Amino acid sequence: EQVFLPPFLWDGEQAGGLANLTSLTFNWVLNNNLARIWSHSDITNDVSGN
Amino acid sequence: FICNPPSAQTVLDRLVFIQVPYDITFTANPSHAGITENLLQPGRDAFRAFPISSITNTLNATINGFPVNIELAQIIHALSRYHTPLKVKNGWMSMQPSFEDN
Amino acid sequence: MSNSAIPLNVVAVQEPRLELNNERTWVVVKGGQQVTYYPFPSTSFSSNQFNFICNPPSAQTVLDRLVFIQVPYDITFTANPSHAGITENLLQPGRDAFRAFPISSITNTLNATINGFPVNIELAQIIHALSRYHTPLKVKNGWMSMQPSFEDNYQSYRDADGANNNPLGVFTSAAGLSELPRGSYTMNVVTNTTTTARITGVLYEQVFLPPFLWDGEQAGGLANLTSLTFNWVLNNNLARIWSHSDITNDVSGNSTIGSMNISFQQPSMYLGFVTPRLNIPIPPRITYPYFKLSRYTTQFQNTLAPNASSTFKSNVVQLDSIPRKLYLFVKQSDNVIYQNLNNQITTPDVFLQINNLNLTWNNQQGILSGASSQNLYDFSVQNGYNKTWSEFNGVTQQFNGVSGQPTKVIGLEGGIVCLELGKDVGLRDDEAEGVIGNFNLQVQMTVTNTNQYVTVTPDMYIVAVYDGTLVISNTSAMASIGVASKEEVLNARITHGVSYNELQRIYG
Amino acid sequence: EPDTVYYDILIPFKPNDQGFSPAIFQAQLTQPIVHNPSEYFLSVVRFSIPTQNIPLTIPQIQPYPNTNVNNTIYSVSIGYNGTYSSQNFVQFDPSLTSPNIPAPNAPTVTSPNVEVTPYYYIYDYSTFLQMINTALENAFNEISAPVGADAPFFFYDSNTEKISLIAQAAYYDRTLTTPIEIYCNVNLFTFFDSIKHIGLGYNTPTGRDILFDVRFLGNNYYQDPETAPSYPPEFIQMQQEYPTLSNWNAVKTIQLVSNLLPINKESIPSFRNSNVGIINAQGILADFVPLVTNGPEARISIDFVATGPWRLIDMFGSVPIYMVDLYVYWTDQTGGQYLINIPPGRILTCKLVFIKKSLSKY
């Protein structure tokens, strides 16, 4: 997965990098649900439908 | 993650990303049964795009002790719709599942 | 504005919908009178090698850089014992086409001397590296539309059919305003059944090697040439032009097709001479950019399959000058696939996937050793790679939904890493992209094979490409690599003036 | 710009269609709280959490070979003459809890430990002791006699508030020459102690060490309560003096974290051993261990009114703040996260403070 927040960039154009850094650090907090990763078709249900 | 640049006056490139090995199991719901045919289907079920970003409540990074954060969950699916061209869509972006919901 | 940590300077712009004032001019567009064209037919073609020679009219007529060669042909296939089977028309709608690109794939080498100094490019394998690399959709769909030029994306034809992006299908079945598949290119069928088939047509292919160009924009065409002679030389095998799918052939490994022969009728080549206006004259002596591909190849004895990994060692080399660009794709070997045609016609044009690479430029080792395969793809795309991450490193989980078969895996395409030495490797100070000295590389690397079907013995590659300047004056052809000195290169007055990207274009 | 501004964070209650609430709140605020947060020490008073929903304990399963997802790292013993009984472990049966959650899958070679599903949660003492009971009972029956005698059982008083151990009573008291005995897995021990216990050599191969001692030795006689009283009394009782709430708890910490406030990032400790190392960095706001002793009920609720002195965290960049983001978690060893859950009847409430750095520090 790409890190998506500027300054960092996701469009293929290239521009200067951030010198003169001392310490970068990230942090990812996951959204509670975790089912949301998957997708589905409403069709396969079918007809009840659970 | 927590990672300090290796050396003095070392410029840092601006494309950053993260790989994450996973494991998932699906279980059948004992109603409507059957229920014939394999749970996962051929052109029926695959990852949501883009997966990790969508299930991130928020991600934070602090460049050099000053904090910068974005809200990945809802911002994305709209920020993803443009300014994308085909050239770019096919490039860097492609790594993460990349197609929209038509 | 002077509100930042360091004061910065301001300017204003106007929104597109209103200037509404700024100085306008009228730009008349002057181009020499009398543009002409002519088919130069081949003085003494043959079946083995053919070759044209043409002389530009005089010292003052500027020939243009885009050249191509059209060649008429016929073929004929005949069903062999003892496969049959032997049912249905010997060709089938979804299964047959020319290889992209057809006569390029057969050329052993194309040599073309200019003004008396001979520059040549080997073409059988060097052409496929360069093929995926720099083109985008809008330029793929322009000039390079004349040769049947859609890249083979599966690891074997067998699986392809029938996907609506299958590499050799019929015109209908290919989506709207897209790259149309290989099968679509027209030639008439005089006959077709079981036991026999015969086709006739005329296939274009534009001569590839620089200076002559295949990408859309125009740079001043060579002048003032005095004389110019191409000549090809083809691989004896020749059976490679046609490509055929696997499914149709029956089990016991028996092949429907084998064997068949090709024919050519005298072919031609179209040059375009332009001559300048009365008052504007062209300088006595001029200077064009001069590129130069090379190929180094190393084969081994060991084999891996149907999906096991391996690591390998490229042979050591010594390089006269740091080259601009390099390509490092490992592909199914050439030793095999010229032996025994059905396989020779059948095999696709994909290479094995790169699990990672470790490289050593001079006196350092371990360059890129901790960079995950995914990283390579990003730099390669940045150079223009143009293919999606899914195919690079290709494999795909297409899953079955029937109780209770296992779920097919597909071998997909290949990966071909490229690095630019200034961009990517980093050259020690005092040294830069053009400079000369002796820098030895040796690229170890690990690879997995992916197609589920066959065992593969693999021969690695490295294409390098130096950048030089070549001066033409009639009739002379001085050419020099690295123009370019160590002290001058170091002093390097640097202009915050030109962009990088514009620089990117006049590739390559 | 003013010297100090307080803020209140409360989360209401939101169930899924499937009854569950995430104790997180997050909000974009329609107008900045601090004009410029470079000069504020942020600290928190008065935060409070409904704990009504947490297990009392997550009982531990033996990491294999062990293919019944069910039986645990627990055991008991009986002795007589003294013929022993091979220890029967204890089987944490679902239908005394649930019964309606899917059970997980016991893990050969691969990874050996069964991951914790909400399925393993046990609330009460009433529910766990009632499990040892079905074990001692089932144990005893391999070694009968003499004559008639019930195997012992554990019971927990309400307001005692102490667990007990009841056993006859003219045998098997330890002062008689023919006594029957109890042993354990020395692991299960931690809950039961402090009953009165003779020690025996820790973790011996063949089960059995530690020896709950009946004999009194006490103002200790007990009877009934299911018949009219009789002399001498029915059974000996040995309630633990200490009363613990305790070793029992699955709650080892709780942790509010907030991925928004400019803040500074302090590391939380792991439970990993190898290694330590490895400092991590994420913002950590306020967080406390269970304060012994707030006496049950503390199972009912945790609470932390600040009592002084101000404990400061820092703040960094110069972005006017637009979001209050806050997450609450409760951790168990082995140290897994488990984001806290808010019960149908209660509201979860923090408070906050910004102080202008200049007043506090030169």
UniProtKB/Swiss-Prot annotation, chain C:
It is found in: Virion. It comes from the Viruses. GO terms for cellular component: viral capsid. Keywords: Capsid protein, Virion. May self assemble to form an icosahedral capsid. Most abundant protein in the virion. This is Putative capsid protein V20. It comes from Sputnik virophage. The lineage of its organism: Viruses, Varidnaviria, Bamfordvirae, Preplasmiviricota, Maveriviricetes.
